[PDB]
Amino acid sequence: DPLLRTGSVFGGLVRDVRRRYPHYPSDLRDALHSQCVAAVLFIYFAALSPAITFGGLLGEKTEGLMGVSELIVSTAVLGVLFSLLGAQPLLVVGFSGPLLVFEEAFFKFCRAQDLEYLTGRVWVGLWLVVFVLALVAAEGSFLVRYISPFTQEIFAFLISLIFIYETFYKLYKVFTEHPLLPFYPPEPSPRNQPNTALLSLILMLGTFFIAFFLRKFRNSRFLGGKARRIIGDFGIPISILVMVLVDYSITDTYTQKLTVPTGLSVTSPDKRSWFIPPLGSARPFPPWMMVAAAVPALLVLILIFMETQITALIVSQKARRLLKGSGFHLDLLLIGSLGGLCGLFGLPWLTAATVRSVTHVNALTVMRTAIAPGDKPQIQEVREQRVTGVLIASLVGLSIVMGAVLRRIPLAVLFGIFLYMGVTSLSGIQLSQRLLLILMPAKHHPEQPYVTKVKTWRMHLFTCIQLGCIALLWVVKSTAASLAFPFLLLLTVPLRHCLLPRLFQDRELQALDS
Amino acid sequence: DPLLRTGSVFGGLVRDVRRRYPHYPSDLRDALHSQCVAAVLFIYFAALSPAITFGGLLGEKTEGLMGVSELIVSTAVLGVLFSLLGAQPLLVVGFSGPLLVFEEAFFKFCRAQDLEYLTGRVWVGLWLVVFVLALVAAEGSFLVRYISPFTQEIFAFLISLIFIYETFYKLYKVFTEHPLLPFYPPEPSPRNQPNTALLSLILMLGTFFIAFFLRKFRNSRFLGGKARRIIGDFGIPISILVMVLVDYSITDTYTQKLTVPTGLSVTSPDKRSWFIPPLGSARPFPPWMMVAAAVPALLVLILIFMETQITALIVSQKARRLLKGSGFHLDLLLIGSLGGLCGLFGLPWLTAATVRSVTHVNALTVMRTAIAPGDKPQIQEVREQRVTGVLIASLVGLSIVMGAVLRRIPLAVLFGIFLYMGVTSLSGIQLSQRLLLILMPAKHHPEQPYVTKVKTWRMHLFTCIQLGCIALLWVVKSTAASLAFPFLLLLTVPLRHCLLPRLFQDRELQALDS
């Protein structure tokens, strides 16, 4: 019962510490295996590229005040600290879309009022630190017990759908940069090149299909058990290596490659330094802004709390076989304090990444070798350790000095990898199966508890409601009112507790929503 | 059984006629279904393109004496006649590689000795007619009873392997014609074009994968039974239509398309006419060649007999549920007489086509709708009729006036179709399963009669022997001694009946070989 209220100050935190910290030698010792290396290699590429993409976007939005080097430094430091001191070291911290929305809105507001951007960020971070400390000291992390699987499925489905859409849009942009023309006259990024878009499509699809086939090969009957396990563990590194070698063989055509800034330097050395004075560098900071920086701190707190807590709820479900424990108090305090303190040095804030954390958990899941003939395998265990997170964060930080190796890797391979992650993440969602049940004939539905106890037309209404919520949230995100997306999602918690009982019966809701 | 020796002249022929001809109204009536249209559409493209390819090759080899129009006329006429009067109307007649080898060798010999090519062909055809009549009159089509599944499996495996290899070589030649260059300076088929090779690869792979996925969709669990069964039948027409539309959408890039000669005319109107005088046109034909034309007639007879009889043996196996009967005497007489008479008009000879006939049988197989959960579907029936063969032959003959529609179809779609046919044809061979059993561990082998009654190391020696025979036949075929290919295959019939019993026992041979 980690969500019970004790009535003492900092009670949940000491309970989490006493529950988790004794397992520390076990956490260090469980990492001696071959699956950990494959997980590290997969998640390193899964985590590095969004840093580069969002760093480029942030540098475009904030006129070079924050770029790629700042985001890389923040990701590395926060990831290392969270993995070392966290109660759930299987979570991956990183940047996200709502954070970018908040940063661009705050930059516009600061430029409108003739204020320094980084000083406002400093005071916002300090207010956020105060708010997180006050919330944790009041054991306020028990409200998570009101977050039903309704909102969890909605959140996971929306996030994975957006991930897949963005990957496809990135692929499409190549075809507009490099169109297929009749004549290519002979001649600062290259533009209007021949054989560039089609090769990119081929590389992306090849990587995706090789990874998917190698994943299917694990449950087959060919070869020995050990060879099957080893090949199944290393499917994605093998796909990446094969497609990179294939692309390297063709040396006549232009393809875009990974570019990482060289050296540990601030993006604009003339405009700013690594430390931001809290009282002002060029002008004195007005006290009224220092007082009034609380509202953006409240928005950031709501965003971070929602994302981190929903990710921790999804990751630690009972069907996923998590044993060492879960922390709903220590993780929030760690993330809030580190994010608030990051404002002093002009680094962006971070939160727990959902798809990356789910993929990290999946890459360490060990299934039963004694697969029943013609039956889906069941989860045997999950490897719990702290080495993988520290290694991934260290590699992300160290990528600055390894630009030479990273320069040989095309982006279409990573597009295929991201497609694989997005497609795989949607298979652990019950809404996915309840959506597949729409196509099957009414006599073909399986024996799940939501099938026997509910009529079909009363099971499809729940799915329609969830899909309507997902569509409305996507529409809200796409328009100019995206800054209110974290709030609207939290509005689906009253709906399941005040309105759904008025339509459904308690017995139906017990089986459908569980 | 139809393979017994009655002891009377023409006994087998009258037995075949009396067994098969009473079913004629049922043969005409069984064609009223939707599956027949899909089979016609698939096999029409499967049969038309080899006519064009071999017509081009023959026109190259024979210096324009025989080309594409002659091959099309021969295919149409012989197919219509065989389908109308045959005892096994599920066989498809057409040109093949050994026939091309024979024509090239005979042209070289006629050129060396200063003889007319077409008059020699005329006398060869007459001798072939005489030989076939003499062979059928002595009920000599009973030796087929000595052809064990050893030879049948070897033949089928070799033919399908060669088919797949030729498709891949065609794609490679497409790439070599249009290399990937850095600069494409603007300047008789087009050469050195941009975006042509990669688009061809994409079209081929897309067609193959769409067809394969739609074939898998048949045994699925979604939608109604009627929709599933309609979509499963029309998978290949749907693939072709989708990829043709996709290729038509892109109007910037060059792709090669189907080219069919216009009009019913001889390839070289100056050199020859439609009728070849048997006594000589420009010079008198020496009588010594008229006598000595028997040896090439013997070679052609051996080739046609071997190919047709092995194809009929493979098609009419007991596992395929053939009910209306089989023809081993009428088919040989029909093919031999028509081929021999074709020499008078300067048209090439024909034989039964193995992959095309197997594909034609597969396209008309109906499985049980009551598929057991997690079980292989069972063959319910095969639709026997004569309408499909007549329609396919008529369409092949009529493709001369339909060049406008045919000119909008790229060749990469057909490459994907041929890959699908070749891959599908190798799944009905027991050697394929016995070759897959090498990879599996010895404890996962199935309960087939060749697994329980034979030791594991004793059933791999049989597979190694068969594979060695296949490799030796391929090597012999590729070299300059290819004219001896039909003989060497017939040398595998003594091997099973004279040397194999000296190593294996009666029980092992009975279990391994049917």
Side-chain angles (χ1 to χ4, degrees), chain A residues 180 182 184 186-187 195 221-223 252 439-441 444, chain B residues 180 182-184 195 198 221-223 252 439-441 444:
Chain A
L180 303 197
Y184 285 101
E187 299 289 326
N195 311 318
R221 221 42 67 188
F222 304 95
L223 269 71
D252 229 351
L439 317 161
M440 293 208 189
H444 283 288
Chain B
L180 300 196
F183 276 101
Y184 282 104
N195 308 318
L198 297 170
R221 264 200 92 230
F222 305 94
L223 272 71
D252 249 344
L439 314 165
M440 300 205 174
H444 291 290

PDB file of all heavy atoms in Angstrom, chain A residues 180 182 184 186-187 195 221-223 252 439-441 444, chain B residues 180 182-184 195 198 221-223 252 439-441 444:
ATOM      1  N   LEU A 180      11.550  14.468 -57.094  1.00  0.00           N
ATOM      2  CA  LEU A 180      11.899  13.664 -58.262  1.00  0.00           C
ATOM      3  C   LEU A 180      11.677  14.508 -59.512  1.00  0.00           C
ATOM      4  O   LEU A 180      10.535  14.818 -59.865  1.00  0.00           O
ATOM      5  CB  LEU A 180      11.073  12.382 -58.314  1.00  0.00           C
ATOM      6  CG  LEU A 180      11.105  11.399 -57.140  1.00  0.00           C
ATOM      7  CD1 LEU A 180      10.566  10.050 -57.580  1.00  0.00           C
ATOM      8  CD2 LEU A 180      12.504  11.248 -56.569  1.00  0.00           C
ATOM      9  N   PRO A 182      12.657  15.537 -63.774  1.00  0.00           N
ATOM     10  CA  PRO A 182      13.070  14.918 -65.041  1.00  0.00           C
ATOM     11  C   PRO A 182      14.545  15.132 -65.341  1.00  0.00           C
ATOM     12  O   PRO A 182      15.264  14.179 -65.653  1.00  0.00           O
ATOM     13  CB  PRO A 182      12.182  15.616 -66.079  1.00  0.00           C
ATOM     14  CG  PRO A 182      11.051  16.195 -65.299  1.00  0.00           C
ATOM     15  CD  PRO A 182      11.642  16.580 -63.984  1.00  0.00           C
ATOM     16  N   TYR A 184      18.282  16.917 -64.020  1.00  0.00           N
ATOM     17  CA  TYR A 184      19.052  17.372 -62.864  1.00  0.00           C
ATOM     18  C   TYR A 184      20.307  18.064 -63.376  1.00  0.00           C
ATOM     19  O   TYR A 184      21.351  17.422 -63.566  1.00  0.00           O
ATOM     20  CB  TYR A 184      19.392  16.207 -61.940  1.00  0.00           C
ATOM     21  CG  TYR A 184      18.207  15.743 -61.134  1.00  0.00           C
ATOM     22  CD1 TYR A 184      17.496  14.614 -61.502  1.00  0.00           C
ATOM     23  CD2 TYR A 184      17.780  16.453 -60.023  1.00  0.00           C
ATOM     24  CE1 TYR A 184      16.404  14.194 -60.777  1.00  0.00           C
ATOM     25  CE2 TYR A 184      16.689  16.039 -59.292  1.00  0.00           C
ATOM     26  CZ  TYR A 184      16.005  14.909 -59.674  1.00  0.00           C
ATOM     27  OH  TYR A 184      14.916  14.491 -58.949  1.00  0.00           O
ATOM     28  N   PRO A 186      23.787  20.131 -63.696  1.00  0.00           N
ATOM     29  CA  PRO A 186      24.931  20.214 -62.784  1.00  0.00           C
ATOM     30  C   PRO A 186      24.979  21.548 -62.057  1.00  0.00           C
ATOM     31  O   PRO A 186      24.551  22.584 -62.575  1.00  0.00           O
ATOM     32  CB  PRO A 186      26.139  20.041 -63.711  1.00  0.00           C
ATOM     33  CG  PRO A 186      25.649  20.477 -65.051  1.00  0.00           C
ATOM     34  CD  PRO A 186      24.204  20.070 -65.108  1.00  0.00           C
ATOM     35  N   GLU A 187      25.508  21.509 -60.839  1.00  0.00           N
ATOM     36  CA  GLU A 187      25.604  22.695 -59.994  1.00  0.00           C
ATOM     37  C   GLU A 187      26.547  23.731 -60.597  1.00  0.00           C
ATOM     38  O   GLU A 187      26.149  24.865 -60.864  1.00  0.00           O
ATOM     39  CB  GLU A 187      26.075  22.313 -58.588  1.00  0.00           C
ATOM     40  CG  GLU A 187      25.141  21.360 -57.853  1.00  0.00           C
ATOM     41  CD  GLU A 187      23.841  22.021 -57.437  1.00  0.00           C
ATOM     42  OE1 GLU A 187      23.862  23.229 -57.116  1.00  0.00           O
ATOM     43  OE2 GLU A 187      22.798  21.334 -57.430  1.00  0.00           O
ATOM     44  N   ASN A 195      18.131  10.562 -56.533  1.00  0.00           N
ATOM     45  CA  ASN A 195      18.209   9.267 -55.856  1.00  0.00           C
ATOM     46  C   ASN A 195      18.327   9.390 -54.339  1.00  0.00           C
ATOM     47  O   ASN A 195      18.848   8.484 -53.685  1.00  0.00           O
ATOM     48  CB  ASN A 195      19.372   8.426 -56.394  1.00  0.00           C
ATOM     49  CG  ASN A 195      19.399   8.364 -57.903  1.00  0.00           C
ATOM     50  OD1 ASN A 195      18.365   8.215 -58.546  1.00  0.00           O
ATOM     51  ND2 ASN A 195      20.587   8.477 -58.477  1.00  0.00           N
ATOM     52  N   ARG A 221      11.049 -22.179 -33.809  1.00  0.00           N
ATOM     53  CA  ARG A 221      11.569 -23.459 -33.352  1.00  0.00           C
ATOM     54  C   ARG A 221      12.919 -23.808 -33.958  1.00  0.00           C
ATOM     55  O   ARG A 221      13.439 -24.893 -33.689  1.00  0.00           O
ATOM     56  CB  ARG A 221      10.561 -24.572 -33.656  1.00  0.00           C
ATOM     57  CG  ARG A 221      10.408 -25.590 -32.542  1.00  0.00           C
ATOM     58  CD  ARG A 221      10.371 -24.928 -31.172  1.00  0.00           C
ATOM     59  NE  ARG A 221       9.172 -24.122 -30.976  1.00  0.00           N
ATOM     60  CZ  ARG A 221       8.970 -23.323 -29.937  1.00  0.00           C
ATOM     61  NH1 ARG A 221       9.871 -23.195 -28.977  1.00  0.00           N
ATOM     62  NH2 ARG A 221       7.834 -22.634 -29.859  1.00  0.00           N
ATOM     63  N   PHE A 222      13.503 -22.922 -34.759  1.00  0.00           N
ATOM     64  CA  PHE A 222      14.768 -23.211 -35.417  1.00  0.00           C
ATOM     65  C   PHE A 222      15.942 -22.934 -34.487  1.00  0.00           C
ATOM     66  O   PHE A 222      15.843 -22.139 -33.550  1.00  0.00           O
ATOM     67  CB  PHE A 222      14.907 -22.383 -36.694  1.00  0.00           C
ATOM     68  CG  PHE A 222      13.780 -22.577 -37.665  1.00  0.00           C
ATOM     69  CD1 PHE A 222      12.702 -21.713 -37.675  1.00  0.00           C
ATOM     70  CD2 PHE A 222      13.799 -23.627 -38.565  1.00  0.00           C
ATOM     71  CE1 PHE A 222      11.664 -21.892 -38.563  1.00  0.00           C
ATOM     72  CE2 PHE A 222      12.763 -23.811 -39.452  1.00  0.00           C
ATOM     73  CZ  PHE A 222      11.695 -22.943 -39.452  1.00  0.00           C
ATOM     74  N   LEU A 223      17.057 -23.617 -34.754  1.00  0.00           N
ATOM     75  CA  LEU A 223      18.298 -23.464 -34.001  1.00  0.00           C
ATOM     76  C   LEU A 223      18.117 -23.831 -32.532  1.00  0.00           C
ATOM     77  O   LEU A 223      17.040 -24.274 -32.121  1.00  0.00           O
ATOM     78  CB  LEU A 223      18.834 -22.037 -34.134  1.00  0.00           C
ATOM     79  CG  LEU A 223      19.801 -21.772 -35.289  1.00  0.00           C
ATOM     80  CD1 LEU A 223      19.080 -21.796 -36.624  1.00  0.00           C
ATOM     81  CD2 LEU A 223      20.513 -20.447 -35.090  1.00  0.00           C
ATOM     82  N   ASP A 252      27.847   6.923 -53.944  1.00  0.00           N
ATOM     83  CA  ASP A 252      27.646   7.875 -55.030  1.00  0.00           C
ATOM     84  C   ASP A 252      26.583   8.917 -54.728  1.00  0.00           C
ATOM     85  O   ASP A 252      26.603   9.987 -55.346  1.00  0.00           O
ATOM     86  CB  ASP A 252      27.277   7.146 -56.327  1.00  0.00           C
ATOM     87  CG  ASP A 252      28.113   7.605 -57.503  1.00  0.00           C
ATOM     88  OD1 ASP A 252      28.852   8.596 -57.348  1.00  0.00           O
ATOM     89  OD2 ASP A 252      28.046   6.963 -58.572  1.00  0.00           O
ATOM     90  N   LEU A 439     -13.678  -5.111 -35.457  1.00  0.00           N
ATOM     91  CA  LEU A 439     -13.693  -5.739 -36.774  1.00  0.00           C
ATOM     92  C   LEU A 439     -14.151  -7.190 -36.712  1.00  0.00           C
ATOM     93  O   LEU A 439     -14.831  -7.661 -37.630  1.00  0.00           O
ATOM     94  CB  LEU A 439     -12.307  -5.653 -37.410  1.00  0.00           C
ATOM     95  CG  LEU A 439     -11.579  -4.316 -37.277  1.00  0.00           C
ATOM     96  CD1 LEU A 439     -10.092  -4.491 -37.524  1.00  0.00           C
ATOM     97  CD2 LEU A 439     -12.168  -3.290 -38.228  1.00  0.00           C
ATOM     98  N   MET A 440     -13.788  -7.910 -35.654  1.00  0.00           N
ATOM     99  CA  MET A 440     -14.132  -9.318 -35.550  1.00  0.00           C
ATOM    100  C   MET A 440     -15.641  -9.494 -35.400  1.00  0.00           C
ATOM    101  O   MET A 440     -16.314  -8.662 -34.785  1.00  0.00           O
ATOM    102  CB  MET A 440     -13.423  -9.952 -34.361  1.00  0.00           C
ATOM    103  CG  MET A 440     -11.922 -10.022 -34.506  1.00  0.00           C
ATOM    104  SD  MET A 440     -11.202 -11.396 -33.596  1.00  0.00           S
ATOM    105  CE  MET A 440      -9.458 -11.028 -33.763  1.00  0.00           C
ATOM    106  N   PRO A 441     -16.199 -10.566 -35.958  1.00  0.00           N
ATOM    107  CA  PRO A 441     -17.630 -10.828 -35.785  1.00  0.00           C
ATOM    108  C   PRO A 441     -17.977 -11.121 -34.335  1.00  0.00           C
ATOM    109  O   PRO A 441     -17.166 -11.630 -33.559  1.00  0.00           O
ATOM    110  CB  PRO A 441     -17.886 -12.047 -36.679  1.00  0.00           C
ATOM    111  CG  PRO A 441     -16.726 -12.082 -37.618  1.00  0.00           C
ATOM    112  CD  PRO A 441     -15.566 -11.559 -36.839  1.00  0.00           C
ATOM    113  N   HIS A 444     -16.915 -14.121 -32.544  1.00  0.00           N
ATOM    114  CA  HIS A 444     -15.493 -14.425 -32.531  1.00  0.00           C
ATOM    115  C   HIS A 444     -14.728 -13.753 -31.398  1.00  0.00           C
ATOM    116  O   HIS A 444     -13.503 -13.899 -31.328  1.00  0.00           O
ATOM    117  CB  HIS A 444     -14.861 -14.056 -33.877  1.00  0.00           C
ATOM    118  CG  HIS A 444     -15.140 -15.047 -34.959  1.00  0.00           C
ATOM    119  ND1 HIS A 444     -14.554 -16.294 -34.978  1.00  0.00           N
ATOM    120  CD2 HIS A 444     -15.944 -14.992 -36.046  1.00  0.00           C
ATOM    121  CE1 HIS A 444     -14.977 -16.962 -36.033  1.00  0.00           C
ATOM    122  NE2 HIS A 444     -15.822 -16.194 -36.698  1.00  0.00           N
TER     123      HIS A 444
ATOM    124  N   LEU B 180      23.335   4.390 -60.681  1.00  0.00           N
ATOM    125  CA  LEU B 180      23.205   5.539 -59.790  1.00  0.00           C
ATOM    126  C   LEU B 180      24.454   6.401 -59.936  1.00  0.00           C
ATOM    127  O   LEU B 180      25.527   6.042 -59.441  1.00  0.00           O
ATOM    128  CB  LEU B 180      23.013   5.092 -58.343  1.00  0.00           C
ATOM    129  CG  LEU B 180      21.804   4.220 -57.988  1.00  0.00           C
ATOM    130  CD1 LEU B 180      21.581   4.220 -56.489  1.00  0.00           C
ATOM    131  CD2 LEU B 180      20.551   4.676 -58.709  1.00  0.00           C
ATOM    132  N   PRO B 182      26.501  10.381 -59.897  1.00  0.00           N
ATOM    133  CA  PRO B 182      26.468  11.634 -59.133  1.00  0.00           C
ATOM    134  C   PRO B 182      25.853  12.769 -59.931  1.00  0.00           C
ATOM    135  O   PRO B 182      25.077  13.568 -59.398  1.00  0.00           O
ATOM    136  CB  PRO B 182      27.948  11.905 -58.820  1.00  0.00           C
ATOM    137  CG  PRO B 182      28.733  10.807 -59.503  1.00  0.00           C
ATOM    138  CD  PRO B 182      27.829  10.153 -60.486  1.00  0.00           C
ATOM    139  N   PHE B 183      26.194  12.841 -61.215  1.00  0.00           N
ATOM    140  CA  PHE B 183      25.715  13.884 -62.105  1.00  0.00           C
ATOM    141  C   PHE B 183      24.998  13.253 -63.289  1.00  0.00           C
ATOM    142  O   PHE B 183      25.444  12.244 -63.842  1.00  0.00           O
ATOM    143  CB  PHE B 183      26.870  14.760 -62.602  1.00  0.00           C
ATOM    144  CG  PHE B 183      27.240  15.861 -61.657  1.00  0.00           C
ATOM    145  CD1 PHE B 183      28.345  15.739 -60.832  1.00  0.00           C
ATOM    146  CD2 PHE B 183      26.485  17.018 -61.589  1.00  0.00           C
ATOM    147  CE1 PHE B 183      28.690  16.750 -59.958  1.00  0.00           C
ATOM    148  CE2 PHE B 183      26.824  18.032 -60.716  1.00  0.00           C
ATOM    149  CZ  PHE B 183      27.928  17.898 -59.899  1.00  0.00           C
ATOM    150  N   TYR B 184      23.881  13.861 -63.680  1.00  0.00           N
ATOM    151  CA  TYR B 184      23.031  13.356 -64.758  1.00  0.00           C
ATOM    152  C   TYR B 184      22.882  14.462 -65.791  1.00  0.00           C
ATOM    153  O   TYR B 184      21.860  15.160 -65.834  1.00  0.00           O
ATOM    154  CB  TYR B 184      21.677  12.894 -64.221  1.00  0.00           C
ATOM    155  CG  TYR B 184      21.747  11.546 -63.549  1.00  0.00           C
ATOM    156  CD1 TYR B 184      21.720  11.438 -62.169  1.00  0.00           C
ATOM    157  CD2 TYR B 184      21.876  10.384 -64.294  1.00  0.00           C
ATOM    158  CE1 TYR B 184      21.799  10.211 -61.550  1.00  0.00           C
ATOM    159  CE2 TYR B 184      21.955   9.152 -63.682  1.00  0.00           C
ATOM    160  CZ  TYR B 184      21.916   9.073 -62.310  1.00  0.00           C
ATOM    161  OH  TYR B 184      21.993   7.847 -61.693  1.00  0.00           O
ATOM    162  N   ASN B 195      16.451   7.922 -60.977  1.00  0.00           N
ATOM    163  CA  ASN B 195      15.311   7.456 -60.187  1.00  0.00           C
ATOM    164  C   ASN B 195      14.582   6.277 -60.822  1.00  0.00           C
ATOM    165  O   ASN B 195      13.421   6.015 -60.490  1.00  0.00           O
ATOM    166  CB  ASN B 195      14.315   8.592 -59.918  1.00  0.00           C
ATOM    167  CG  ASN B 195      14.975   9.820 -59.338  1.00  0.00           C
ATOM    168  OD1 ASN B 195      15.832   9.722 -58.465  1.00  0.00           O
ATOM    169  ND2 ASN B 195      14.576  10.986 -59.818  1.00  0.00           N
ATOM    170  N   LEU B 198      15.684   2.407 -58.491  1.00  0.00           N
ATOM    171  CA  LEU B 198      15.124   2.324 -57.144  1.00  0.00           C
ATOM    172  C   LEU B 198      13.604   2.240 -57.173  1.00  0.00           C
ATOM    173  O   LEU B 198      13.001   1.511 -56.378  1.00  0.00           O
ATOM    174  CB  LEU B 198      15.583   3.520 -56.313  1.00  0.00           C
ATOM    175  CG  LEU B 198      17.087   3.641 -56.057  1.00  0.00           C
ATOM    176  CD1 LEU B 198      17.401   4.979 -55.442  1.00  0.00           C
ATOM    177  CD2 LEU B 198      17.580   2.520 -55.165  1.00  0.00           C
ATOM    178  N   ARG B 221      -9.194 -13.841 -38.816  1.00  0.00           N
ATOM    179  CA  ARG B 221     -10.370 -13.987 -37.987  1.00  0.00           C
ATOM    180  C   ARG B 221     -11.276 -12.762 -38.067  1.00  0.00           C
ATOM    181  O   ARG B 221     -12.294 -12.711 -37.370  1.00  0.00           O
ATOM    182  CB  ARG B 221      -9.908 -14.272 -36.546  1.00  0.00           C
ATOM    183  CG  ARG B 221      -9.896 -15.782 -36.227  1.00  0.00           C
ATOM    184  CD  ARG B 221      -9.918 -16.175 -34.748  1.00  0.00           C
ATOM    185  NE  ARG B 221     -11.232 -16.399 -34.154  1.00  0.00           N
ATOM    186  CZ  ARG B 221     -11.632 -15.838 -33.022  1.00  0.00           C
ATOM    187  NH1 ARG B 221     -10.867 -14.975 -32.376  1.00  0.00           N
ATOM    188  NH2 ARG B 221     -12.821 -16.159 -32.520  1.00  0.00           N
ATOM    189  N   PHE B 222     -10.943 -11.796 -38.922  1.00  0.00           N
ATOM    190  CA  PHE B 222     -11.683 -10.548 -39.013  1.00  0.00           C
ATOM    191  C   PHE B 222     -12.741 -10.611 -40.107  1.00  0.00           C
ATOM    192  O   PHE B 222     -12.719 -11.488 -40.973  1.00  0.00           O
ATOM    193  CB  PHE B 222     -10.727  -9.392 -39.290  1.00  0.00           C
ATOM    194  CG  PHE B 222      -9.617  -9.283 -38.295  1.00  0.00           C
ATOM    195  CD1 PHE B 222      -8.391  -9.878 -38.537  1.00  0.00           C
ATOM    196  CD2 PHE B 222      -9.792  -8.574 -37.124  1.00  0.00           C
ATOM    197  CE1 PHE B 222      -7.369  -9.777 -37.622  1.00  0.00           C
ATOM    198  CE2 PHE B 222      -8.778  -8.474 -36.207  1.00  0.00           C
ATOM    199  CZ  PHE B 222      -7.564  -9.073 -36.454  1.00  0.00           C
ATOM    200  N   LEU B 223     -13.683  -9.665 -40.052  1.00  0.00           N
ATOM    201  CA  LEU B 223     -14.741  -9.505 -41.049  1.00  0.00           C
ATOM    202  C   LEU B 223     -15.597 -10.758 -41.195  1.00  0.00           C
ATOM    203  O   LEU B 223     -15.393 -11.748 -40.486  1.00  0.00           O
ATOM    204  CB  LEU B 223     -14.151  -9.116 -42.405  1.00  0.00           C
ATOM    205  CG  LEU B 223     -13.945  -7.624 -42.682  1.00  0.00           C
ATOM    206  CD1 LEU B 223     -12.813  -7.041 -41.853  1.00  0.00           C
ATOM    207  CD2 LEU B 223     -13.711  -7.389 -44.165  1.00  0.00           C
ATOM    208  N   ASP B 252       6.921  11.642 -63.574  1.00  0.00           N
ATOM    209  CA  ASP B 252       8.170  12.341 -63.857  1.00  0.00           C
ATOM    210  C   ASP B 252       9.292  11.425 -64.311  1.00  0.00           C
ATOM    211  O   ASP B 252      10.231  11.906 -64.953  1.00  0.00           O
ATOM    212  CB  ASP B 252       8.638  13.131 -62.630  1.00  0.00           C
ATOM    213  CG  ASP B 252       8.541  14.629 -62.836  1.00  0.00           C
ATOM    214  OD1 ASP B 252       8.405  15.061 -64.000  1.00  0.00           O
ATOM    215  OD2 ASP B 252       8.595  15.376 -61.837  1.00  0.00           O
ATOM    216  N   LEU B 439      17.394 -27.579 -39.899  1.00  0.00           N
ATOM    217  CA  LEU B 439      17.686 -26.503 -38.957  1.00  0.00           C
ATOM    218  C   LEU B 439      17.104 -26.786 -37.576  1.00  0.00           C
ATOM    219  O   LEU B 439      17.723 -26.456 -36.560  1.00  0.00           O
ATOM    220  CB  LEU B 439      17.150 -25.177 -39.496  1.00  0.00           C
ATOM    221  CG  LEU B 439      17.437 -24.857 -40.964  1.00  0.00           C
ATOM    222  CD1 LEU B 439      16.553 -23.718 -41.439  1.00  0.00           C
ATOM    223  CD2 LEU B 439      18.904 -24.518 -41.166  1.00  0.00           C
ATOM    224  N   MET B 440      15.918 -27.388 -37.520  1.00  0.00           N
ATOM    225  CA  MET B 440      15.243 -27.606 -36.251  1.00  0.00           C
ATOM    226  C   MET B 440      16.006 -28.614 -35.394  1.00  0.00           C
ATOM    227  O   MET B 440      16.671 -29.512 -35.917  1.00  0.00           O
ATOM    228  CB  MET B 440      13.824 -28.109 -36.480  1.00  0.00           C
ATOM    229  CG  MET B 440      12.952 -27.169 -37.274  1.00  0.00           C
ATOM    230  SD  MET B 440      11.205 -27.407 -36.914  1.00  0.00           S
ATOM    231  CE  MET B 440      10.481 -26.056 -37.836  1.00  0.00           C
ATOM    232  N   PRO B 441      15.933 -28.483 -34.071  1.00  0.00           N
ATOM    233  CA  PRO B 441      16.526 -29.495 -33.194  1.00  0.00           C
ATOM    234  C   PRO B 441      15.781 -30.815 -33.303  1.00  0.00           C
ATOM    235  O   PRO B 441      14.598 -30.870 -33.645  1.00  0.00           O
ATOM    236  CB  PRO B 441      16.384 -28.889 -31.793  1.00  0.00           C
ATOM    237  CG  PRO B 441      16.115 -27.434 -32.021  1.00  0.00           C
ATOM    238  CD  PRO B 441      15.362 -27.364 -33.306  1.00  0.00           C
ATOM    239  N   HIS B 444      12.113 -31.455 -31.997  1.00  0.00           N
ATOM    240  CA  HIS B 444      10.967 -30.697 -32.483  1.00  0.00           C
ATOM    241  C   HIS B 444      10.464 -31.182 -33.838  1.00  0.00           C
ATOM    242  O   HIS B 444       9.565 -30.560 -34.411  1.00  0.00           O
ATOM    243  CB  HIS B 444      11.308 -29.208 -32.559  1.00  0.00           C
ATOM    244  CG  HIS B 444      11.486 -28.559 -31.221  1.00  0.00           C
ATOM    245  ND1 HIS B 444      10.436 -28.332 -30.358  1.00  0.00           N
ATOM    246  CD2 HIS B 444      12.592 -28.083 -30.601  1.00  0.00           C
ATOM    247  CE1 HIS B 444      10.887 -27.749 -29.263  1.00  0.00           C
ATOM    248  NE2 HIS B 444      12.192 -27.586 -29.385  1.00  0.00           N
TER     249      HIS B 444
END
